[PDB]
Amino acid sequence: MGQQPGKVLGDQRRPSLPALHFIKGAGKRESSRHGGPHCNVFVEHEALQRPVASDFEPQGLSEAARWNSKENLLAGPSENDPNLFVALYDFVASGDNTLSITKGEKLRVLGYNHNGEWAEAQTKNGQGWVPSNYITPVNSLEKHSWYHGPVSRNAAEYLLSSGINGSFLVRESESSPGQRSISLRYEGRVYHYRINTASDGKLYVSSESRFNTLAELVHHHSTVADGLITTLHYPAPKRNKPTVYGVSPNYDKWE
After folding, report:
1. Within this chain, do residues 38 and 153 fall inside the same structural domain, yes or no?
2. 248 lies in which domain range?
3. Are strands 84-87 and 135-137 parallel, antiparallel or unpaired?
4. Are 85 and 136 within 8 A, CB to CB?
C-alpha cells in the first residue's frame, strides 16, 4: 500500500500535504525558550547555532526533478540562538501527530523524517510534525552566503554555475536529515562531495577530521589541505546580491 508515483507538490501557494506514514508518537522536547522582533530589517550579532546535528535518521532518496524556483523567503536571524524557522503558510493541526502553525509564526524545528515526509517542530502551540512546504529557516546558517539550507542538486549546481574557481556551496538534503553536501567549482569544473554525519550528529568530510559544528567544518575546509582539490575560497551568491564585508588586520603576538 501507500502508492503515489504521480508528481505531487507543484509550484503554488498552499502546496500539497504528504501522507502520514511515520508518526513519532511523542518526539523530543525542550529546544530553547526564545523568539525575536518581527522587524523586516535587522542583522546578526554572533554565530547562528547549529552544533552537533539534532536532525538524524538519514535516507538518500532518489530525488526526481522538482523544476521550479520561487524566492527564498529569508526574513533574518537572532542574536546567538538555535536555527529558528518561520511558517510561510497557515497549517491547522490535523491531529496530535501534527503541529498547528500560522504564517508569520517563528517555529523551532527539532529535525526532519528520513523519507522527507514531515519536519518535527515545536512552538507556543505545542509540538508535532509540520510540512516542509509551509516553512522556511531564518536564523539558520542559510542567511550566510556559504550555507543555502535544504536544496535540490539542480538549485545547488545552478547557484554554483554563477560561481568561479574556489567557489563553494554548503547545503543539506530536503528529503534526508543529517545528509549534507558541499559543492565546489574550480577551473569552471563543478564537483560535489558528501558531508558524513556520525552517530551523535558530528559532521566530517574527511577521515582525518571531526567537527562538532558546521561553522568549524566550513572554516577548517576554507583553510585546509585535507582532501580538498581547492580550499573553500568564496561562496556562490544569493539571487539578490547582498552587501557584507570584513578585514580585521592581523597584529601578531608570540608571548
Report:
1. no
2. 140-255
3. antiparallel
4. yes
